[PDB]
Paper text:
CaSR was originally identified as being involved in regulating plasma calcium levels and is central in calcium homeostasis. CaSR is activated not only by calcium ions but also by a wide range of amino acids and γ-glutamyl kokumi peptides. We have recently found that γ-EVG functions as a positive allosteric modulator (PAM) for CaSR, similar to some amino acids.
By adding calcium ions, γ-EVG, and two PAMs, etelcalcetide and evocalcet, we obtained a cryo-EM map of the active state of CaSR at a resolution of 3.97 Å. To obtain more detailed structural information about the binding mode of γ-EVG binding to CaSR, local refinement of the VFT domain was performed, and the density map resolution was improved to 3.55 Å. In our cryo-EM structure, the amino group of γ-Glu, namely the N-terminus of γ-EVG, formed a hydrogen bond with the main chain of Ala168 and the side chain of Glu297. The carboxyl group of γ-Glu formed a hydrogen bond with the side chain of Ser147 and the main chains of Ser147 and Ser170. Glu297 of CaSR had no hydrogen bond with L-Trp. These results suggested that the hydrogen-bond interactions of γ-Glu with three residues (Ala168, Ser147, and Ser170) were conserved and may be important in the binding of amino acids and γ-Glu peptides to CaSR. For Arg66, which interacted with Gly in γ-EVG, mutation to alanine reduced its function compared to the wild-type, but mutation to a negatively charged glutamate residue completely abolished the activity. This observation strongly suggests that both the hydrogen bond formation with Arg66 and the positive charge of Arg66 affect the γ-EVG binding.
Residue numbers in the entry:
A (entry chain A), B (entry chain A): 24 to 45, 50 to 118, 137 to 358, 399 to 541
Amino acid sequence: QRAQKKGDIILGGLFPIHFGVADLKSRPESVECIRYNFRGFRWLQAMIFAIEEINSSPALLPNLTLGYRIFDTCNTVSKALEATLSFVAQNSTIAVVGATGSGVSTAVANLLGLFYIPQVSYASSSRLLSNKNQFKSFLRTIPNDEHQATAMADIIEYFRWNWVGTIAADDDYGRPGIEKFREEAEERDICIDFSELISQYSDEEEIQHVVEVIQNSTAKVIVVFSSGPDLEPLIKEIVRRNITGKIWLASEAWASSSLIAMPQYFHVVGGTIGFALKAGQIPGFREFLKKVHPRKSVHNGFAKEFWEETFNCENISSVETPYIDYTHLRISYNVYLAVYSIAHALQDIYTCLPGRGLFTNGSCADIKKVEAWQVLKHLRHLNFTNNMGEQVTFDECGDLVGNYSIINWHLSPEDGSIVFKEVGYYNVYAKKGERLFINEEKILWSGFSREVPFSN
Amino acid sequence: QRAQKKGDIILGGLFPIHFGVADLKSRPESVECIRYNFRGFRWLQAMIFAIEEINSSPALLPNLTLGYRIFDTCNTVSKALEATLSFVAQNSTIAVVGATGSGVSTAVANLLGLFYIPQVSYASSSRLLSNKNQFKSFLRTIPNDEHQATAMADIIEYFRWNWVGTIAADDDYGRPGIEKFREEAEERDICIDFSELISQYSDEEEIQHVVEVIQNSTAKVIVVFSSGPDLEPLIKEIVRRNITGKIWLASEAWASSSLIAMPQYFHVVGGTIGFALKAGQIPGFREFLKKVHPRKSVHNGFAKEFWEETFNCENISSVETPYIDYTHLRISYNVYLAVYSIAHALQDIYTCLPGRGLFTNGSCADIKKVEAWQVLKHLRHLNFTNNMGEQVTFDECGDLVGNYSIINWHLSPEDGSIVFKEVGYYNVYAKKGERLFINEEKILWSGFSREVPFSN
């Protein structure tokens, strides 16, 4: 299954269409995914949507079509790596949209970097990815977790808390991020009661042990740096243990994750203050999402599966699912800018006056035979503006930043569903000590109480 | 340059023959190594030595020759990855000796795992490599750093110290290891004055900052988890800063590293207590090392370089160098067992009675057409004995353990060189609290003083 389309310029794509895959008595026989990832399918959608829009856009890259080769990482390096090999078979993909996971992106960046194939991630936020010495051809349209780690400490200090816990996934997006927060704390005089590591495949024993350490601890505030899949197993047992009254500080990855944000668990996950990326605006994207259908599209071979999953195999709106059930496009917007950033780099090459080329002898690149390294060069020196009206320009470490959005989980009496209410903002562009804004109101501590909890 | 030799069974090899490699105005043009790694060349030597010995060994694998395909990782994933691709071009290498670096091995294990190619590392000691969920085809002949992290804490508690520092390389062999030690401390009531991260390519500013944090701190004991190259830059400035009286606790990687262990720095690096792996015994290896010569051997294309480096381009003994200047073979012995472990696995396949096969239907594998996954199966269930007289059998996470050797750096008045005197032992096979033995004598605190230093 691969969303593929013919084009003069081919752009690779790696998306988590699923959440994870299922001795050697025989051939390994590969492995199969076992959990469809709605929203993740809406991701590749944006990518394809942006490609179509730019093809229909005469101003951007005229007399030139752009094709795409998009696969499924399924939150597994193995499937992601097999794909990355398929991308560098000739070395042709001029660029590949980075994967979402920090660990998955790390591995793909290793191979892609060897051939200097520009990789623009849309979710990877691991500080380790900023090592251009190893990740030379890595670029990310999402802020690193260094800023996030700082914001959490600010919030804990803001509510006068000195006794807190810690739970991070045993992988790139968590262990490194927590390290930064640990350093953020202690300096602000915030003692850490306990530190725990969880995984999507933690043994039931491990889960029991971490739940045991969650209890016992007198700390009521517990910071959590983990994606939805890794924290899914832990929260499940916490729910049956019915451990309530523990306030959780989400970490973006699971701040808007439906995997954890479900009414059946609101008893414990209720009132979880987390961090969301600034909501972007992709116009005409809603209609594109509704115009999906098997037999139709054809290129997006991923539709069949989607349809089977959304219709137990008919209007998409008929069946509720995170695919079209969205209020703010955040990571989806990141993907849109990611493909647009490459589009502008290619357009720059298409429009480079001789003697004004960033290449040697001020020479330009023949887009008729553009090379990936040439795109990387331009991508490094990219300074265009966003559709939202915002100058976009990757930094020296190929990273662009943006303010966060403090969010608090609240229950809606209309449908009993979990509505995420913005409660404050964190201005990254601001100065230190004047970057955090949290309206004390709109904060339902522990899902209901409106009195700041005690955590000393 | 590749040490290659024809054989029915081909075993890959990745060794750090060097210590590291040297915009996009033009094609990247690859990169070149810039520091020969003596001892590292002595490593591949052992590998080749073991291959020859087993070929000349009729009992082990009769009527069967074994060829090798060995390259240079040069402490760089990029060169290492390019090699790993060369190994899986057909997928043929039945097995590849793992690299030395934790980060380099991690990446190679990703690709090798995809094709289930058994990888047996000889130095990689990163706990993260024990994640068989990701590293399914990873096996290591060296203990993880979890045991080491425990030993350090024991030593600090043994000498009644509560105020200590921390300096780890910003990579797999350091950041994860220190995390374990941090947890080891605090529990033993050992406060950490400061924690710093260093790299082989840390900016001079970074070096100045870490040296500044090294000073100021009242902590006299400073634990250091880093390989020789990463700590080389920091120690250089500490020497010019002439910061003396600071006791250092080596971490195996640099406990016997000539890069740091040099008389010109004994003023600061003097009296550094570190951890060394149990010394193994490879018989007849000395003569093999002396029988090296360009024009001769031919297969080891790495000789030319070696010769140029050892003779500024003649008897090898004439020129002193860590290649033949060795008193205890440790990692070299690890490589010997690594290739022997594969040899025994292949011999098991060569001798499997029908109906007694670890494969389905109790079927054996046709060694005439042996597959890598079949070798992996056998490697998992390997239980042979060492030449030193020791049963060798990888654990569930493909890791074998061994007692460590507390070492203290001492100056020899005969040549003014830095002699490493064994001072104690750490029995991993022993119980908790009864595994650490450090003779208080033979300990020259700060290189000279014989009075336990004060670090509160």
